[PDB]
A paper describes a structure:
To address whether the N-terminal residues missing in the [name]Δ1 construct might harbour an important site for RhoGTPase mediated plexin activity, we solved the crystal structure of the entire cytoplasmic domain of [name] (Plexin-B1cyto) in complex with [name]*. The asymmetric unit contains a trimeric arrangement comprising three copies of the Plexin-B1cyto-[name]* unit, with each [name]* molecule contacting two Plexin-B1cyto molecules. It covers a total buried surface area of ∼570 Å2, therefore significantly extending the interface for [name] binding, and is dominated by hydrophobic interactions.
Plexins are transmembrane receptors distinguished by their ability to interact directly with small GTPases of the Ras and Rho family through their intracellular region.
Residue numbers in the entry:
A (entry chain A): 1 to 178
B (entry chain D): 1563 to 1757, 1764 to 1854, 1880 to 1890, 1916 to 2023, 2032 to 2129
The structure:
Amino acid sequence: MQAIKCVVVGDGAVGKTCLLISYTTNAFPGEYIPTVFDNYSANVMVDGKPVNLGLWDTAGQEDYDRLRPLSYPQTDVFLICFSLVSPASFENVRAKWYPEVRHHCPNTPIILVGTKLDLRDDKDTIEKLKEKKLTPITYPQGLAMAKEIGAVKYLECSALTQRGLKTVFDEAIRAVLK
Amino acid sequence: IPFLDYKVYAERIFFPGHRESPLHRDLGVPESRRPTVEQGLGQLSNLLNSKLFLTKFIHTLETQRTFSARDRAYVASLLTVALHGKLEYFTDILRTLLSDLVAQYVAKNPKLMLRRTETVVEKLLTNWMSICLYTFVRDSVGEPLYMLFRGIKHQVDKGPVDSVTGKAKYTLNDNRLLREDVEYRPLTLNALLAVAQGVPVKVLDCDTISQAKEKMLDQLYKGVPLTQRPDPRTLDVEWRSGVAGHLILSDEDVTSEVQGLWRRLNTLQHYKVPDGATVALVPCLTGIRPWHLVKPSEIYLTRLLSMKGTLQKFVDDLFQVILSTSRPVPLAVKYFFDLLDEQAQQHGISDQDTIHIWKTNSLPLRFWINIIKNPQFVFDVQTSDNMDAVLLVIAQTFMDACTLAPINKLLYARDIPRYKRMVERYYADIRQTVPASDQEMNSVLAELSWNYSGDLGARVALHELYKYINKYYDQIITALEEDGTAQKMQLGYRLQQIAAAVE
Ligand SMILES: Nc1nc2c(ncn2[C@@H]2O[C@H](COP(=O)(O)OP(=O)(O)NP(=O)(O)O)[C@@H](O)[C@H]2O)c(=O)[nH]1
Ligand SMILES: [Mg+2]
């Protein structure tokens, strides 16, 4: 019986809480409420082995920054997040997240995760992007980021569809075992 | 209402500094010479019951240069625990010792009487009073004394507090008054005791996680005496948010504010804790200068009057009970103040003003002053530092009213001529009421060796008292044989026998 402490740190409204809820209930939240320090729990089976995944939600706000370091101790695997529908949330990976994570935990494996996959392929969303003169994140843009930060994998997914979300965590379990 | 039982009350009064009675420990004698010593000590007790011996014993110690006033307290206190049986005799020991003190003050200045423990008897009558008045204290004065203590505690926390320097928005002392003002908002968070039902607690965003833990406990164990309450060092503060909260905040951790040589403490505002936060007190898991509100390095009448004005409520009441004429005069008081009046005519002192300061530095300025000053003598409570500065400034207000002649003076100057009335009003009863017969007295003194539950530490008391005898042995032999009756009594040999019985 191996327990894996997984902390999900990501930019304001990248969809962490949602992706964490989607994996553990198979139901999407809907309403946005800025998460303070929420804890989740799931009992998984990866390569014929039972594991208890003790999830940790965090804030994406500069307000709840004076408290976030407390979630960090003895983390087995980190989950650095961003939204594929915002490069601002992606640029803050190299800027805020990666620095913060390694400043404390220098050994913990990182997994860069691109949330909101469903919105990238949507036309109506790209309209708002074009209006502020911006372009969404693609697989090579993100794969270049994960190799740059030293992430043990790069996974794209979506919480509303549960597309490749199963894989995201199964890979994080594998990221610990070796 | 946390009342200390007689055992605790007495131990705390006779033996204050150590906190706990140093008369609680085993003798330190091996099983072999253990019974031969235990017996000898017994003979020391029978030796002590000789008024003829005891008088000379103390008189010899008082004269010794090496005998500090610290020993004078310990010797009086050990003797009190020793003679806790022979109370009728303990009074006679004092009756005689009083008359001795009286004659000595005639030469220099009789007004300076019972000011400092430069004599052993000065401590014995504070102990004597305590034994006698314990009932009265628990029975009548206890109530407003607890009220004032809860009242001060409450009224201080309605203001911010520096967990370092020790200053607050409210106090009765400038040396303790928080000069600077800080940005504080009032919190009212639902506190759980997960060691599970939620009690609402009123803190302040500025309070450190520590002060906040104490303020939480105060409600989570409202009427539980300190000894029955669990230790706070075994407890940890844990905040809660969303489906599963779980975040153990602390006074100083990863999120501490280091500014070179200045590291700040962690407050509720510091963690961004909001009103109604679910905080649980859960068990413990386990040269930068620390600060909180004002980093360490004129009156403000207006600031202190707000505090005085709050506390006046019970200030009036506590004094109106101590100095009560409505209730009858307790026998121990009446007997004693007439024990002084008997002495006043023996040496010819018509002046009642000289009599009053012996009377004041007896019952109020000896006894009552201490209980106001330090409330940890009646209640099983943790007294704050700023709390004591407040209480002491209430004791120095009561004191100024006792005696016929700064902050405390021209602060309570409104109520001080009112209390001076109460003092005289109380001494009117002291003389106007029926005097107490010694026949009627020792009747009460006996029931106090009865109603004293157990062994306050008499074993150790005799052994510790021998620790003295052992050092000043020969100087004692001097007075043991220089006296004629002492030879007849065969006191010298009585002692010698005990001396060898120990070693
Ligand atoms: N279409 C779509 N929307 C998503 C997806 N994931 C999240 N969202 C949306 O974007 C917002 C994300 O909510 P949330 O999970 O709390 O983001 P967060 O990163 O956890 N916020 P915080 O920084 O406060 O922790 C919500 O309004 C939600 O509806 C997704 O996969 N697909
Ligand atoms: Mg959130």
